[PDB]
mmCIF file of all heavy atoms in Angstrom:
data_model
loop_
_atom_site.group_PDB
_atom_site.id
_atom_site.type_symbol
_atom_site.label_atom_id
_atom_site.label_comp_id
_atom_site.label_asym_id
_atom_site.label_seq_id
_atom_site.Cartn_x
_atom_site.Cartn_y
_atom_site.Cartn_z
ATOM 1 N N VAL B 54 -11.896 31.521 -16.634
ATOM 2 C CA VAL B 54 -12.813 30.452 -16.873
ATOM 3 C C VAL B 54 -12.921 29.619 -15.621
ATOM 4 O O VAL B 54 -11.928 29.543 -14.841
ATOM 5 C CB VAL B 54 -12.314 29.615 -18.109
ATOM 6 C CG1 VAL B 54 -11.024 28.903 -17.774
ATOM 7 C CG2 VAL B 54 -13.394 28.749 -18.627
ATOM 8 N N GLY B 55 -14.062 28.947 -15.432
ATOM 9 C CA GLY B 55 -14.130 28.035 -14.264
ATOM 10 C C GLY B 55 -14.279 28.808 -12.974
ATOM 11 O O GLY B 55 -15.000 29.849 -13.014
ATOM 12 N N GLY B 56 -13.627 28.349 -11.910
ATOM 13 C CA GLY B 56 -13.650 28.870 -10.565
ATOM 14 C C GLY B 56 -13.282 30.320 -10.453
ATOM 15 O O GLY B 56 -14.009 31.184 -9.884
ATOM 16 N N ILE B 57 -12.206 30.615 -11.144
ATOM 17 C CA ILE B 57 -11.741 32.000 -11.214
ATOM 18 C C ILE B 57 -12.764 32.886 -11.849
ATOM 19 O O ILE B 57 -13.025 34.068 -11.448
ATOM 20 C CB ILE B 57 -10.320 32.139 -11.797
ATOM 21 C CG1 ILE B 57 -9.771 33.588 -11.653
ATOM 22 C CG2 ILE B 57 -10.222 31.832 -13.294
ATOM 23 C CD1 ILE B 57 -9.577 33.897 -10.188
ATOM 24 N N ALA B 58 -13.434 32.414 -12.928
ATOM 25 C CA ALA B 58 -14.497 33.200 -13.525
ATOM 26 C C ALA B 58 -15.680 33.427 -12.572
ATOM 27 O O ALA B 58 -16.301 34.495 -12.596
ATOM 28 C CB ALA B 58 -14.928 32.629 -14.802
ATOM 29 N N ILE B 59 -16.003 32.386 -11.783
ATOM 30 C CA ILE B 59 -17.131 32.541 -10.882
ATOM 31 C C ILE B 59 -16.759 33.587 -9.783
ATOM 32 O O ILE B 59 -17.543 34.459 -9.491
ATOM 33 C CB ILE B 59 -17.374 31.193 -10.157
ATOM 34 C CG1 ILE B 59 -17.895 30.161 -11.170
ATOM 35 C CG2 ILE B 59 -18.274 31.421 -8.926
ATOM 36 C CD1 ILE B 59 -18.073 28.821 -10.515
ATOM 37 N N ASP B 60 -15.499 33.580 -9.325
ATOM 38 C CA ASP B 60 -15.075 34.602 -8.376
ATOM 39 C C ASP B 60 -15.003 35.941 -8.954
ATOM 40 O O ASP B 60 -15.304 36.879 -8.280
ATOM 41 C CB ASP B 60 -13.640 34.262 -7.842
ATOM 42 C CG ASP B 60 -13.588 32.987 -6.990
ATOM 43 O OD1 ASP B 60 -14.616 32.446 -6.647
ATOM 44 O OD2 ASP B 60 -12.486 32.506 -6.818
ATOM 45 N N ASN B 61 -14.508 36.099 -10.168
ATOM 46 C CA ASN B 61 -14.339 37.410 -10.794
ATOM 47 C C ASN B 61 -15.516 37.973 -11.502
ATOM 48 O O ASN B 61 -15.651 39.211 -11.705
ATOM 49 C CB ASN B 61 -13.066 37.437 -11.684
ATOM 50 C CG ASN B 61 -11.776 37.258 -10.906
ATOM 51 O OD1 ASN B 61 -11.849 37.232 -9.666
ATOM 52 N ND2 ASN B 61 -10.684 36.994 -11.597
ATOM 53 N N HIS B 62 -16.405 37.077 -11.935
ATOM 54 C CA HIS B 62 -17.444 37.487 -12.809
ATOM 55 C C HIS B 62 -18.862 36.964 -12.515
ATOM 56 O O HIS B 62 -19.785 37.336 -13.161
ATOM 57 C CB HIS B 62 -17.112 37.135 -14.260
ATOM 58 C CG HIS B 62 -15.947 37.879 -14.719
ATOM 59 N ND1 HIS B 62 -15.993 39.194 -15.081
ATOM 60 C CD2 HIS B 62 -14.647 37.480 -14.852
ATOM 61 C CE1 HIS B 62 -14.747 39.626 -15.395
ATOM 62 N NE2 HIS B 62 -13.944 38.640 -15.276
ATOM 63 N N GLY B 63 -18.942 35.965 -11.641
ATOM 64 C CA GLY B 63 -20.187 35.411 -11.200
ATOM 65 C C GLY B 63 -20.662 34.170 -11.933
ATOM 66 O O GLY B 63 -21.682 33.666 -11.623
ATOM 67 N N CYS B 64 -19.904 33.657 -12.965
ATOM 68 C CA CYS B 64 -20.327 32.456 -13.725
ATOM 69 C C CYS B 64 -19.047 31.816 -14.246
ATOM 70 O O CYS B 64 -18.031 32.535 -14.432
ATOM 71 C CB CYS B 64 -21.308 32.764 -14.828
ATOM 72 S SG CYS B 64 -20.696 33.759 -16.146
ATOM 73 N N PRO B 65 -19.095 30.484 -14.512
ATOM 74 C CA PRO B 65 -17.843 29.873 -15.072
ATOM 75 C C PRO B 65 -17.387 30.166 -16.511
ATOM 76 O O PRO B 65 -16.303 29.791 -16.954
ATOM 77 C CB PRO B 65 -18.136 28.381 -14.917
ATOM 78 C CG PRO B 65 -19.510 28.258 -14.425
ATOM 79 C CD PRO B 65 -20.200 29.576 -14.412
ATOM 80 N N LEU B 66 -18.280 30.691 -17.281
ATOM 81 C CA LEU B 66 -18.005 31.027 -18.659
ATOM 82 C C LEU B 66 -18.541 32.431 -18.943
ATOM 83 O O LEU B 66 -19.613 32.605 -19.588
ATOM 84 C CB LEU B 66 -18.579 29.963 -19.636
ATOM 85 C CG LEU B 66 -18.203 30.123 -21.109
ATOM 86 C CD1 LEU B 66 -16.736 30.046 -21.349
ATOM 87 C CD2 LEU B 66 -18.879 29.129 -22.018
ATOM 88 N N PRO B 67 -17.775 33.448 -18.633
ATOM 89 C CA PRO B 67 -18.267 34.806 -18.875
ATOM 90 C C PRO B 67 -18.521 35.086 -20.336
ATOM 91 O O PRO B 67 -17.796 34.595 -21.185
ATOM 92 C CB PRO B 67 -17.161 35.681 -18.305
ATOM 93 C CG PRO B 67 -16.589 34.886 -17.244
ATOM 94 C CD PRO B 67 -16.633 33.448 -17.728
#
Side-chain angles (χ1 to χ4, degrees):
Chain B
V54 69
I57 189 65
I59 293 176
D60 294 347
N61 294 353
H62 295 284
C64 66
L66 185 63

